Design a protein around this ligand. Sequence first.
Ligand SMILES: COC(=O)N[C@H]1CCC[C@@H]1[C@](CN1CCC1)(c1cccc(F)c1)C1CCN(CC2CN(c3ccc(S(=O)(=O)C4CN(C(=O)CCCN5CCCCC5)C4)cc3)C2)CC1
Length: 481
Amino acid sequence: GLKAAQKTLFPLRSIDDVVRLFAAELGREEPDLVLLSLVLGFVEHFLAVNRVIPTNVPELTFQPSPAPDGLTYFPVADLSIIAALYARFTAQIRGAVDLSLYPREGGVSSRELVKKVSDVIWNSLSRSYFKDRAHIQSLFSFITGTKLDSSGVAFAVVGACQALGLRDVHLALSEDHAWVVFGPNGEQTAEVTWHGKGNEDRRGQTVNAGVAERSWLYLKGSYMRCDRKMEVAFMVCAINPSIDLHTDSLELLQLQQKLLWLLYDLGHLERYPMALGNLADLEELEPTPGRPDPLTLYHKGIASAKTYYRDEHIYPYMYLAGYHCRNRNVREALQAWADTATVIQDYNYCREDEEIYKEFFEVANDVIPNLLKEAASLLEASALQDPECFAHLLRFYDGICKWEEGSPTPVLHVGWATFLVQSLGRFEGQVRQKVRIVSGTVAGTARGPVLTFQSEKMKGMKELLVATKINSSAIKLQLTA
Ligand SMILES: COC(=O)N[C@H]1CCC[C@@H]1[C@](CN1CCC1)(c1cccc(F)c1)C1CCN(CC2CN(c3ccc(S(=O)(=O)C4CN(C(=O)CCCN5CCCCC5)C4)cc3)C2)CC1
């Protein structure tokens, strides 16, 4: 229910009023996910979904204020609008789940209870809508339009469980999928949403098969297990400032940035690597005085992945590579993509890993070839003269090759082979042979660049990659075999 401590902070007539609600809620023993998701969805609706201020709607008012280069109008989150939306969600869940039928073994939710709550959210959704549509992530979207994206359904099941008073059900997250964790120690797992485009319905099952398989989608079991504060962080990361393909809401960017600093300062981003990369992206767009630099924040994201998730996360390095690409730091961008491939090498490419395959396919066959092409234009009146860039390029391919080893389906095909030959060819013979590809002579210690290949394919290509005249057919045949 909504208490006085919550209601007295309403109405929210500004960005700072919304931040105050979140600061107050984060200080409570159990932060209300439903209320916080509704507010974000309400303000996102008028700031990005339908910016045209309604004429025939009374009660709904907008707050003018000075915009940094005339006026800007903020959707006033009235207590009556939000409280009615909140009451409608609560009434729906409580009315569909009869908790007397479920034996709560000392504050522990059964699989049967978690599956019923999942079935309630699932059966409420519209029969037909575009799944990759923007702004269908929040509880506002679930209540006003019965539309939720993939991870939105997972968050809604958690929100619904909290409303029923089930403190043991939590959000579980990988870098591309979401499920719930529950039980006496949070070691019980259940699928609650779909994943991919026509990849069946595994809803109600454990994530064991996905973890045992070594797919990137289940991160070999080193996935995030959210507490309530991390679920608030997820919801803030889930804010979509996109108005259209090329424009953003300056208010939603400013709101997500201020909310991410709030979460950061309380230490709730310490175990959320991708939130730190998101904050760093926001800081580069609009630096806030007294705060650390985007580079410091990207490295804090990598440090979190290393400390709490045994360095099995891809996107913290991808965020840093993104920064360096935008700023045209070729060496530092190639280094961060090679570090991404060093992580993926200990995974096996499975059916539902298309999201990360598409990411690697694009860097290896579009982004890197585009970078080295632009770098070659700059040489005609530098990074291509640096043997360290060449070693990063080879370590990157080494990771992709090793990733393919032990995989049920191939990674590298004829399409990759072409861009490897072209990318190798962008470095002169003298620069390429400065790299020492060694296996190591002695193991341990006693009281030009050097590179070691972890993959069979790059190892068998050793001499070809470094030869003055590139044997295209042989490099293509070995990469695709
Ligand atoms: C922090 O935010 C979140 O956690 N968001 C969550 C909340 C709601 C759900 C959302 C989401 C959504 N997914 C579902 C499909 C997308 C998610 C997370 C966990 C579980 C889950 F189910 C869903 C995530 C969204 C954020 N992504 C992370 C980002 C993708 N990524 C990224 C970074 C770099 C590259 S890159 O390949 O390096 C590339 C090339 N490069 C360049 O800059 C080129 C050179 C420059 N040049 C080019 C043009 C000329 C000038 C500049 C960028 C690619 C992707 C960062 C993860 C999934």
